Design a protein around this nucleic acid. Structure first.
Lengths: 15, 417
DNA sequence: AATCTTTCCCACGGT
DNA sequence: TTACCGTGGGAAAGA
């Protein structure tokens, strides 16, 4: 683990 | 008579105050050419930023010197460098950036590569100069055959920056770029993010902290998309080749410039990175009729991939306003090595001198990419030392004969023994 | 000839 | 409404 970030999750959809 | 050379006092004032003016050009690394009278716009549109505290300091100086806010306003124009092709105005009124949405390169230009040219000046006609972007590759149109790793410029390496865009039914008005605003990923029609695309090993876990691999991105590899500005990342994704409006699960060839891509959200029930107006979602794909090797994807789930670049230039009027443009701005990439220091970079000229702190060094110009200089004795910084007693760090700055200061993020340290 | 790259052509669905 | 316009698929031309 060397790269750092802030996780962002998208909302799920299916029609 | 020649203009005033920078004094040791003026340099000390600068080293303490440091109000630098920076010019940034964020653009794509490739561009498709336009034939006849058509216009095939550069996507993402090139963006120019006026960074640093120097712009406010220059504005206030001009106003105190008797300029209106209209005269103190910086003006910009962008176009294809070294061409008979027309320049277009950028609107910088009330913002520190502007995108060039309608740029294109005609087949009349027979060059295989070009640079963008940003012409700048203040509202009172004081010339700033001409800033070039990095080199952009001309394309007739993308190849329909698999990409070989021999053409490194048409491939994408792990740890490089890309832009991603989606277009609905060939309409220019529908173009939306993956972008991060207010801590959220969205699909902007006006702004675009430059995202690091990191290759991950298949066994790498989800987390804000992750290990990266080196190499060229291929379809079917696990990747991480991180905003180069905000550090915002999407979950681990699998980059997949788009054929018509399906994602191919079996394609493993190298990802090529301007190819259509699908981003399967790893370990989900067929969820693909997708847009819905300005909103970024994940949308479930439909299984293909009689085929397991492909999945039918949503309209907002195909993304064109394109490598992006950045040109950056920093300058300061060390002895106040000058007649000559501040351009071409020298850029220092590295430092090497009677003790000599070699500078490697761009836009070096014979009228530059290397300064170590407030101490001006004997400079030898070789070419626009190389410069050598005589390291001052430690006496220049510590009056009676004879040798390096304790480590002494000094900034390395390039200075023009008319007093223009070009800072580097590079220091030189006098090492003991 | 056969095949991939470059240039030319056109209409969908937008302003 | 008509007119005009990027864009992408595809045809034709070139290497």
């Amino acid at each position: 683990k060397r790269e750092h970030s802030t996780l962002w999750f998208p909302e799920g959809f299916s029609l | 008579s020649p203009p005033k050379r920078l004094t040791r006092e003026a340099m000390r004032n600068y080293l303490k105050e440091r109000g630098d003016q920076t010019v940034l050009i964020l653009h794509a690394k490739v561009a498709q050419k336009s034939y006849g009278n058509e216009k095939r716009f550069f996507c993402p549109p090139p963006c120019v930023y006026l960074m640093g505290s120097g712009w406010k300091k220059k504005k206030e100086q001009m106003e105190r010197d008797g300029c209106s806010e209209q005269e103190s306003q910086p003006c910009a124009f962008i176009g294809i460098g070294n061409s008979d092709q027309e320049m277009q105005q950028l609107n910088l009124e009330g913002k520190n950036y502007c995108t060039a949405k309608t740029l294109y390169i005609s087949d009349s230009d027979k060059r295989k590569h070009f640079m963008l040219s940003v012409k700048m000046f203040y509202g009172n006609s004081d010339d700033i100069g001409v800033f070039l972007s990095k080199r952009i590759k001309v394309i007739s149109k993308p190849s329909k055959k698999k990409q070989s790793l021999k053409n490194a410029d048409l491939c994408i390496a792990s740890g490089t920056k890309v832009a991603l865009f989606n277009r609905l039914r060939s309409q220019t008005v529908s173009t939306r770029y993956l972008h991060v605003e207010g801590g959220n990923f969205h699909a902007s029609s006006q702004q675009w993010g430059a995202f690091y695309i990191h290759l991950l090993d298949d066994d790498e876990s989800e987390g804000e902290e992750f290990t990266v691999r080196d190499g060229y991105i291929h379809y079917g590899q696990t990747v991480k998309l991180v905003c180069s500005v905000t550090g915002m990342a999407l979950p681990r994704l699998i980059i997949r080749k788009v054929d018509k409006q399906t994602a191919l699960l079996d394609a493993d060839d190298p990802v090529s410039q301007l190819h259509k891509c699908a981003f399967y959200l790893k370990d989900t029930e067929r969820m693909y990175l997708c847009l819905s107006q300005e909103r970024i979602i994940q949308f479930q794909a439909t299984p293909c009729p009689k085929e397991q090797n492909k999945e039918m994807i949503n309209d907002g789930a195909s993304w064109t991939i394109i490598s992006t670049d950045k040109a950056e230039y920093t300058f300061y009027e060390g002895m106040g306003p000058v007649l000559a443009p501040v351009t071409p701005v020298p850029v220092v990439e590295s430092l090497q090595l009677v003790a000599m220091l070699e500078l490697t970079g761009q836009n070096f000229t014979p009228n530059l001198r290397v300064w170590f702190g407030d101490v001006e060094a004997e400079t030898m110009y070789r070419c626009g990419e190389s410069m050598l200089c005589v390291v001052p004795d430690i006496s220049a910084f510590r009056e009676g030392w004879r040798w390096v007693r304790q480590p002494v760090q000094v900034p390395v700055t390039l200075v023009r004969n008319d007093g223009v200061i070009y800072s580097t993020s590079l220091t030189f340290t006098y090492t003991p023994e």
